[PDB]
Design a binder for these strands. Structure first.
Lengths: 168, 305, 13, 164, 5, 56, 302, 108, 12
DNA sequence: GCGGCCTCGGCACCGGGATTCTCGA
DNA sequence: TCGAGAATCCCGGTGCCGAGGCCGC
């Protein structure tokens, strides 16, 4: 079970952990999220399911974006299954719900209300995008990285706790 | 230069594309080197399909070689007309010491015209040592139908004899019967391997195919494992089955629950290989789906056990 | 203090 | 073909004649846009709503196949929509209806200059029925994008304030 | 067995 | 470096801010229509508690 | 009321307030009034390529001959760029009495070789009737089946004369799974065809497709396992039917079907694709299948 | 989890507001530097946005002059269609309104 | 406008 | 080597062959 | 009980519109 403050922070390290069943798209999103030379260390983490095999030395994880591939109902059954292994103090600010495949709206095995209901019943931001195309990735990557500096505390005015008060 | 022959040649010459006109017209030998220059192959389709057939009107083309033209057309277009695989089986004893291509041609045509008295069987002993039988069918009441022939690729001394699954009529049990009695075998069995790529069926039935620092992937110990298990089940260079690899499931849901699964891909065994690493499939990918070439079978009929 | 970079950069290795 | 004339040889003399006389569905119609500006009628603002919704849907689904070359006619068509609204001065009822539909799916810079001028012309609704539908997303992207999108929203909402 | 698991 | 140590001070005066907020929330031990109302009256009252703090 | 009602409808739709449409199992729709048995029976086993059709401005079900001539003279002119066009009101393809009567558009070529057979129907589509004015006769559904070239010509004619616009209706795999579930929930007998679900995995290099074809009676008994509340099927019941398919496929082939997308759900009621070439109408439930299809067309229009 | 998260949200906003009110402005440890490092950084960033904001406020009056011309033209075409529609209203008043049915048959 | 301009300082 | 030209070919909808299963020798 | 006739499940063998090639400006 992941907790927000189980590890100590670094200096400029903002460790986000992507969550999605498909992993090539997660790798593409991670590549785009490090393409821009931002002012923060960006030890991006990938995964498939929140059990997250127990390996110590994992840094203080500052964001978990649940990439829910709307094209595949698996990406929700593997998110909702993985949503039960997140600490309740982790769901406040440091949780986003990416919904890739939205907008195509013809491959969607999942009605975007269902991801809306999931991201509202867990009280966390829900950021639509279409991760397959770099044009909508290289702008969602700069949205996840500015949410990153909010949850990791790099912007010295806004906490992760202040964040969800903005994205309600 | 005949009925159901000249226009048959016309219908098999507009079939062949413009690029490989020389390739197929050189091999069927009616157009010698001198005849190739007379017709300008690069001009038009209706021009060539009219001048070439005239070049057989002077050559008095017969169905015996018109069918050979169709054979040579399919030898480069075998990736159509999905192929069944027949498997012969001799009992206990020595092998076929006499597969004389002349004798096999005799022992096949004689048996086939014994019952199907009006058929135009045309063989073509290919250079890969595999006789490429083509059969135009027709009962005694009708003329041999060259519209829908049943090409049979019998590998010369092999127990396996591919077959173009055209219509699966009452001749199919006679197609196998004539095949297993011409070649000195006793039992003909449809392997139930049915693929559109004969160059892959040949591989399967002969087992001839295998012979950043910032991105911390947390499930690396699982990605490595799934990549491993997809390399000991799909070793290297899988062959394209590209076939409706059916699984006529008859199992109870955990009385039975009938299913008729049909995996359909332009390249199946490579599509399955990129499944588990793509997250669609579990790492041990259900030998029912890995052992398609290992069992030399894709049209499964599984039950519960 | 601060393993961070004030150590890691100085002990660059 | 199309008024391609052959009097060009005569147009030596006919160009002298010109010199001698010198000496001796509705968006791309500015002269007709004034009509729809003046009729707030039912079957014309609906004959026009259904065209805008099915042009901002089909030609925006056109993004999902090119996103680069289709991103210049859509920009130049959204510019015509924007100009038609700046003239006619009320937000087209498909302009908001497309915005609520395509704001959650929207990125920061995909037709930002056009989308955030559409927000300006949004029929004043309640700011209790338009806030959750749109302004809860012009904060979902406002707080995650750079300054250059941030300044493009308080400017967008600046013009929205005047248009309300 | 006929690996129906 | 000083700018980098300044980015650290700042980041840590907010990471300890988060740490103290969480441990105070852990130190402590309903009307959803108003549960967001007594959620809103801080996001306005912490807001006046820290906009004046940032303004000082 | 004339527009602002539609704006409030758009607000309600975009709000996405607790959607799960517990739908009534498609009830046996005894053929209402006329419903020309020859015509409707000809219209059943034809693969309609769905489109979403905005309401037609200034349409009337009296001037069918004038539109027939105006479109016939336009189609054969697109050949200049042998054909007869027969607009035919269907008189019974409507859910409620206030719905506009569905009417056909057939490209009849000598004999009655109906090349194209268009079909506009508005059944149980009273979420559009009560929001559009009287001048528009709204038929959200458009049904092609003729070549795509002729559809992309009659659609242009309809845009030119009626200000109606054809977005190609694409049933998403969510709606596809819904209809695949309510059609094995029906009370039919003598199942015409097996309940096939053509999946299509999202592999980047390859495009493997799966035909999870179930025995139609076996899927009805599997549906009864997940069917608890009668009269109406829920989203959870549909998802449990689909997950019983998933747990009978990943059980067998170890590939998660839920990670794939539906592309076609053949059922004894009505086949249904995704990319548009969707509605085959095997049985005479077409006023219910068309009810779902029109309700889906409203989603695209509104 | 919606309610179980709202309760922890109010519990966390309470802690954060009780900790912000605890945060007195800590200007005592401010900076040992003479602040020229931070000063000539902040004016230089000012130089970075001042060119970047003059470039935007020059386009602002560019588009405002272009739109002043455009909306002056729109106002002209509007007062024209206003006076024209008013004179049409006055003229169509009691000119075509004085239309009798029998007079319409006599004109036929 | 300053929106069409603000889209070309994002790039430049 | 491009401009309006043209020709194969994947996908898919409509037409007979053999299996069901009902009735006559 | 069994033998020919009809219908219809299973998959063709066909129809027909995008893609690739190709010849003036």
């Amino acid at each position: 079970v992941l907790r927000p403050l189980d590890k100590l922070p670094g200096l400029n390290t903002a460790t986000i952990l992507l969550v999605g069943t498909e992993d090539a798209l997660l790798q593409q999103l991670a590549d785009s999220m490090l393409k821009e030379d931002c002012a923060s260390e960006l030890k991006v983490h990938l995964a498939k399911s929140l059990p997250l095999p127990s390996s110590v030395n994992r840094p203080r994880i500052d964001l978990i974006v649940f990439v829910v591939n709307l094209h595949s109902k698996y990406s929700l059954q593997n998110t909702e299954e993985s949503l039960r292994h997140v600490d309740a103090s982790f769901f406040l600010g440091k949780v986003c719900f990416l919904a890739t495949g939205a907008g195509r709206e013809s491959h969607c095995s999942i009605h975007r209300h269902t991801v809306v209901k999931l991201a509202h019943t867990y009280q966390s931001p829900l950021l639509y995008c279409d991760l397959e195309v770099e044009g909508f990735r290289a702008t969602m990557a700069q949205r996840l990285v500015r949410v990153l500096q909010i949850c990791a505390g790099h912007v010295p005015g806004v906490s992760a706790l202040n964040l969800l008060s903005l994205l309600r | 230069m005949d009925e159901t022959v000249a226009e048959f040649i016309k219908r098999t010459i507009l079939k062949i594309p413009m690029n490989e006109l020389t390739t197929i017209l050189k091999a069927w030998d009616f157009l010698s080197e001198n005849q190739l220059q007379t017709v300008n192959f690069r001009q038009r389709k209706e021009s060539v399909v009219q001048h070439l057939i005239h070049l057989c009107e002077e050559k008095r083309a017969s169905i015996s070689d018109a069918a050979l033209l169709d054979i040579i057309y399919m030898q480069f277009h075998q990736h159509q007309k999905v192929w069944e695989v027949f498997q012969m089986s001799k009992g206990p004893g020595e092998d076929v010491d006499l597969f004389d291509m002349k004798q096999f041609k005799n022992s096949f045509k004689k048996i086939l015209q014994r019952a199907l008295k009006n058929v135009t069987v045309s063989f073509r002993e290919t250079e890969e040592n595999a006789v490429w039988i083509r059969i135009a069918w027709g009962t005694q009441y009708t003329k041999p139908n060259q519209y829908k022939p049943t090409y049979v690729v019998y590998y010369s001394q092999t127990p396996y004899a591919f077959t173009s699954s055209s219509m699966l009529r009452r001749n199919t049990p006679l197609l196998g019967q004539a095949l297993t009695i011409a070649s000195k075998h006793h039992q003909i069995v449809k392997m139930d391997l049915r693929s559109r790529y004969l160059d892959s069926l040949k591989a399967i039935v002969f087992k001839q195919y295998n012979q950043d620092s910032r991105i911390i992937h947390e499930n690396i110990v699982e990605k490595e494992r799934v990549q491993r298990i997809t390399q000991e089940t799909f070793g290297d260079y899988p062959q394209p089955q590209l076939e409706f690899a059916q699984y006529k499931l008859e199992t109870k849901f955990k009385e039975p629950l009938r299913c008729l699964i049909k995996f359909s891909s332009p390249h199946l065994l490579e599509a399955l290989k990129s499944l588990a690493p793509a997250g669609i499939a579990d790492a041990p990918l259900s030998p029912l789906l890995t052992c398609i070439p290992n069992k030399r079978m894709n049209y499964f009929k599984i039950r519960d056990k | 203090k601060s393993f961070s970079t004030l150590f890691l950069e100085t002990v660059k290795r | 073909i199309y008024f391609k004339n052959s009097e060009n040889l005569w147009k030596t003399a006919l160009l002298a004649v010109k010199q001698r006389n010198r000496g001796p569905s509705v968006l791309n119609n500015s002269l007709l846009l004034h009509y729809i500006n003046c009729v707030r009628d039912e079957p014309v603002l609906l004959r026009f709503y259904y065209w805008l919704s099915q042009t901002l849907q089909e030609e925006c689904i056109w993004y999902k196949v090119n996103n680069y070359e289709h991103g210049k006619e859509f920009t130049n068509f959204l510019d015509t929509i924007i100009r038609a609204e700046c003239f006619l001065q009320e937000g087209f009822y498909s302009c908001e209806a497309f915005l609520y539909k395509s704001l959650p799916l929207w990125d920061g810079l995909c037709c930002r200059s056009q989308f955030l001028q559409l927000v300006s012309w949004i029929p004043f609704s309640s700011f209790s029925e338009v806030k959750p539908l749109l302004f809860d997303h012009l904060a979902q992207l406002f707080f995650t994008s750079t300054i250059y999108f941030k300044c493009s929203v308080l400017q967008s909402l600046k013009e929205l304030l005047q248009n309300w | 067995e006929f690996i129906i698991d | 470096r000083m700018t980098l140590l300044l980015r650290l001070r700042a980041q840590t005066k907010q990471q300890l801010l988060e740490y103290k907020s969480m441990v105070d929330a852990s130190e402590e031990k309903k009307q959803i229509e108003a549960k967001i109302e007594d959620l809103e009256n801080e996001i306005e009252e912490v807001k006046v508690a820290f906009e004046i703090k940032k303004l000082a | 009321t004339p527009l602002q009602k539609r704006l409030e409808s758009v607000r309600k739709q975009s709000s996405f307030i607790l959607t799960p449409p517990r739908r009534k199992i498609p009830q046996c729709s005894q053929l209402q009034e006329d419903v020309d048995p020859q015509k409707v029976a000809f219209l059943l086993h034809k693969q309609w390529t769905l489109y979403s059709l905005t309401p037609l401005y200034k349409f009337s079900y009296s001037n069918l001959k004038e539109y027939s001539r105006l479109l016939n003279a336009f189609i054969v002119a697109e050949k200049q760029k042998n054909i007869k066009v027969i607009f035919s009101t269907l008189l019974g393809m409507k859910g409620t009495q206030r719905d506009p009567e569905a009417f056909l558009v057939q490209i009849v070529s000598r004999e009655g070789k109906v090349l194209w057979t268009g079909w506009f129907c508005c059944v149980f589509g009273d979420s559009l009737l009560e929001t559009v004015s009287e001048d528009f006769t709204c038929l959200p559904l458009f049904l092609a089946n003729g070549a795509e070239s002729n559809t992309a010509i009659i659609g242009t004619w309809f845009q030119k004369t009626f200000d109606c616009y054809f977005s190609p209706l694409a049933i998403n795999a969510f709606n596809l799974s819904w209809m695949a579930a309510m059609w094995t929930a029906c009370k039919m007998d003598h199942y015409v065809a097996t309940t096939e679900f053509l999946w299509s995995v999202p592999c980047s290099p390859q495009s493997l497709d799966i035909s999870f074809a179930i025995h139609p009676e076996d899927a009805k008994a599997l549906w009864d396992s997940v069917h608890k509340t009668p009269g109406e099927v829920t989203q959870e019941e549909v998802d449990l039917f689909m997950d019983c398919l998933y747990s009978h496929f990943h059980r067998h082939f170890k590939i998660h079907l839920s990670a794939t997308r539906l592309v076609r759900v053949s059922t004894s009621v009505a086949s249904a694709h995704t990319d548009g070439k969707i509605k085959i109408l095997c049985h005479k439930y077409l006023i219910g299948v068309l009810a779902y299809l029109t309700e889906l067309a409203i989603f695209q229009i509104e | 989890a919606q309610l179980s998260l709202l309760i922890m949200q109010v519990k966390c906003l309470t802690a954060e507001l009780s900790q912000w009110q605890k945060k007195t402005p800590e200007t005592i440890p401010l900076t040992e530097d003479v602040l020229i490092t931070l000063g000539k950084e902040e004016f230089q960033k000012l130089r970075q946005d001042l060119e970047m904001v003059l470039s935007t406020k020059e386009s602002k009056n560019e588009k405002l002059k272009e739109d002043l011309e455009r909306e002056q033209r729109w106002l002209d075409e509007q007062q024209q269609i206003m006076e024209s529609l008013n004179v049409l209203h006055s003229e169509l008043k009691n000119k075509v309104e004085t239309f009798s049915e029998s007079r319409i048959f006599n004109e036929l | 406008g300053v929106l069409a301009h603000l889209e070309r300082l994002e790039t430049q």
